[PDB]
């Protein structure tokens, strides 16, 4: 991570993160973060003792848009870190066969797992 080769510091979504499928606008994680924008909208009028459901909708609309915007790139970075974590992981096992052997998976007919009577 903080030391992987070919990394540009302070660089957000890089030139290969775009190879992954983008999160959909109907992403359940994304809309929930939009719901946090909706929640952060209504509470604002509570401190300022304003109608919590029918006050200035410009604040509420701007509260939701900001959350849904910054979330989308975070949700893009979300998968890219996991994809990068998954990518290098599979290269290591391929490059180090001796640390990850394949046991000859044998059926339960041969397995001597003992029986515990409960009574």
């Amino acid at each position: 991570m903080s030391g992987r080769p070919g990394r540009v510091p302070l660089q957000f979504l890089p030139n290969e993160a775009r190879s992954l499928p983008p999160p959909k606008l109907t992403d359940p994680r994304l809309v929930y973060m939009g719901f946090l924008g909706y929640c952060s909208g209504l509470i604002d009028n509570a401190i300022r003792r304003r109608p919590v459901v029918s006050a200035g909708l410009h604040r509420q609309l701007l509260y939701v848009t900001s959350f849904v915007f910054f979330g989308y790139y975070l949700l893009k970075r979300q998968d890219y870190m996991y994809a990068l974590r998954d990518h290098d992981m599979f290269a290591y096992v391929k490059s180090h066969p001796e640390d990850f052997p394949e046991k000859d998976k044998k059926t339960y007919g041969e397995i001597l797992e003992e029986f515990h009577p409960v009574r």
């Binding site: 459901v53 797992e113 003992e114 515990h116 409960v118 009574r119």
Partner: protein, 458 residues
Amino acid sequence: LKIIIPTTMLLPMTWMSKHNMIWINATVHSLLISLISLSLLNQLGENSLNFSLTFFSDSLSAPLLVLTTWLLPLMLMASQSHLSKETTTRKKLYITMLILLQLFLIMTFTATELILFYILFEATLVPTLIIITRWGNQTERLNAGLYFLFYTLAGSLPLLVALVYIQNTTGSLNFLIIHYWSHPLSNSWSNIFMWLACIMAFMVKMPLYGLHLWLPKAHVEAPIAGSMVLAAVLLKLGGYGMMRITTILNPLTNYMAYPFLMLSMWGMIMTSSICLRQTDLKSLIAYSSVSHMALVIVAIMIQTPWSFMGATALMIAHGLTSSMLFCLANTNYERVHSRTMILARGLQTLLPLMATWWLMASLTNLALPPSINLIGELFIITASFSWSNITIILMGMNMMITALYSLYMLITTQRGKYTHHINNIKASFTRENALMALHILPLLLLTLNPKMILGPLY
């Protein structure tokens, strides 16, 4: 999954509705959501009903959710005795807590992950202490919140460390995966503490003899809505947990069970004997709940097919009746403005129908046949007797006391001679009588075909 979204959908329901329609609108949609919940006992065979990656149901959960979804209307009309004088926002926020509570219990039972279960399992606490402390009546309701929550976390937190440990070792804790990828528990000293950590969290939310000080310290002072929901489903959250977590705790369960089931065995006689000597009416059902709740502790510990069925049968049946006796506690308490048992006596000559509800409540808690209380208790006896022959002399001696205090409350309150100086009891409204009816009828008419209630092992 089709239950949760409408359950969340009641959150805007109550919070927006007109000043006088909040309870009407909340009452109906809680009654309508019992439809979609009632389609959850609708079940396939031995395979569980898995309808989503994160949510699943089986014959053990199915009675539970239909209990909670049914339950919320009961606390809705129950709270319509003392919330009338409160402000609208406080009234709306009371529904918010109850609806938020539903959203949790409706989701713990459907959780297919141990941590997701645990996250929501202890998440139900946050709505509770709001109910007990904010809307409580007496003075020591403040001490009620500390006793309830600290007892719960002191056992729940080591379970969280245990769960992540299992996550790292075997790889996953999905309720199916651990069942299929089972592994016997070695007698290593480390496994003993892991077993203890896994079980202790559900023990504290399963009043054990010694880990039960919060039972009389929470139910008595809690509001009426909080009292039944904490006694009817909240105590069962551990019951669901132990039935599930025991799949990975064998064979260490059988050898390690002796310190625990026996403490439940001896205390369940003791706790029932406590009810024989009581001064507070609401303390009767609290302590009676402890003895009944501790009965299934033995059943789950034996891990016997009959015991599990009896545990589930008693689990729902006790929750229904324990909630009922709390409603009858409320009506008498509201009329007399006191919780003392010996104060209000001879109430049957004034409220004949209320006496009949008292009769049915105490007699069902007495666990006569064919009531679900008896069939659940009888299955436990047979399983316990197979485990050991002496078990009958103890758990049978509980039924000795169980019949006593059940009739003791009936005799001293309804029967006898009325106290003359009480000039407060009016005729009972149609609310409580319907509230009692909505408690008694589902229990009785479930008796014809209780096989939705026995559980997955049926």
